[PDB]
Amino acid sequence: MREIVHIQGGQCGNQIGAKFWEVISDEHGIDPTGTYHNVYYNEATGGRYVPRAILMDLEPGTMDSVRAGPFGQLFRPDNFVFGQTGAGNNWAKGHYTEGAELIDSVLDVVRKEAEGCDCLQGFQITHSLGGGTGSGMGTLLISKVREEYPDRIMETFSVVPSPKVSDTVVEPYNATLSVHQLVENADECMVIDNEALYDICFRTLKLTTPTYGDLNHLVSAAMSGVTCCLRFPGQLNSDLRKLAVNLIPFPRLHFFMIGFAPLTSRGSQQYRALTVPELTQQMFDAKNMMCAADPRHGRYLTASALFRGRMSTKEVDEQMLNVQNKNSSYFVEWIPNNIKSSICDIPPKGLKMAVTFVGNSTAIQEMFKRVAEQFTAMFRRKAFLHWYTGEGMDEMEFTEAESNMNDLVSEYQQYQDATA
Amino acid sequence: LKCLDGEDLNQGNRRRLQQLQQRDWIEQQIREKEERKRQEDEEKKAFEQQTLH
Ligand SMILES: Nc1nc2c(ncn2[C@@H]2O[C@H](COP(=O)(O)OP(=O)(O)O)[C@@H](O)[C@H]2O)c(=O)[nH]1
> Do A91 and A237 fall into the same domain?
yes
Same domain, A296 and A319: yes
- A324 with A231: CB under 8 angstroms? no
Residues ≥6 apart with Cβ < 8 Å to A326? none
Cα of first residue to Cα of last residue in chain A, in angstroms, is 42
Q: Give the whole-angstrom CA distance, residue B29 versus residue A219.
A: 52
> Residues A373, A301: contact at Cβ < 8 Å?
no
- Do residues A110 and A14 share a domain? yes
Indicate the resolution in Å: 4.2
A194 is in an annotated binding site: yes
Q: Is residue A268 part of a domain?
A: yes
Query: Hey, of B42, B43, B48, which one would you mutate to test binding to chain A, going by the most A CBs within 10 A of its CB?
Result: B48
CATH number of the domain to which A318 belongs: 3.30.1330.20
Return the sign of the alpha-carbon dihedral for residues A98, A94, A407, A338: positive
Q: What is the dihedral of CA A153, A157, A161, A162, to 10 degrees?
A: 130
- Same structural domain, A198 and A130: yes
Distance between CA atoms of residues A31 and A26, nearest Å? 7
Backbone angles phi, psi at A282, to 5 degrees: -65, -55
In contact, A163 and A195? CB cutoff 8 Å: yes
Q: Which residues of B touch A46 (CB under 8 A)?
A: 48-49, 52
Task: Of A235, A236, A205, give the one whose Cα is nearest residue A221.
Answer: A205
Which residues span the domain enclosing A16? 3-246
- Sign of the Cα torsion A34, A35, A38, A44 reads positive
Q: How far is CA A320 from CA A188, A232, A285, A363, in A?
A: 23, 23, 14, 20
Taking a C-beta distance cutoff of 8 angstroms, is the pair A215, A374 a contact? Answer: no
Q: How was this structure determined?
A: cryo-EM
* Residues of B (23-52) whose Cβ lies below 8 Å from A: 48-49, 51-52
Largest CA distance in chain B: 82
* Amino acid in the structure at residue A76: R
Residues in CB range of A222: below 8 A, 6 or more apart:
A258, A259, A260, A290, A356
The alpha carbon of residue B25 and the mean position of all alpha carbons in its chain are separated, in whole angstroms, by: 4
Q: A-B interface: how many C-beta pairs under 8 angstroms?
A: 6
Residues 6+ apart with CB under 8 A from A58: A82, A83, A84, A85, A86, A87, A94, A98, A102, A133, A137
Question: A293 and A185, same structural domain?
Answer: no
Chain B residues whose CB is inside 8 A of the A45 CB are 48, 51-52
Burial per residue of A367-403, b for 16 or more beta-carbon CB atoms within 10 angstroms, e otherwise = bbebbbebbeebbeeeeebebbeeeebeeeebeebbe
Total domains, chain A: 2
Contacts of B51 in chain A (CB under 8 A): 45
Tell the residue nearest (CA) to atom 3 of ligand 1.
A12
Euclidean distance between CA atoms A70 and A363, whole angstroms:
38
**Residue A14 CB contacts under 8 Å (≥ 6 apart), including other chains:** A8, A55, A57, A62, A63, A65, A66
At A149, which CATH number? 3.40.50.1440
Q: How far apart are CA A63 and CA A399, in angstroms?
A: 35
Alpha carbon A319 to chain centroid distance?
A: 27
Q: A320 with A235, same domain?
A: no
**A332 CA to middle of ligand 1, Å?**
35
* A237, A274: one domain: no
Q: Best substitution site from A159, A223, A290 to test ligand 1's pocket, by max atoms within 8 Å of Cβ?
A: A159
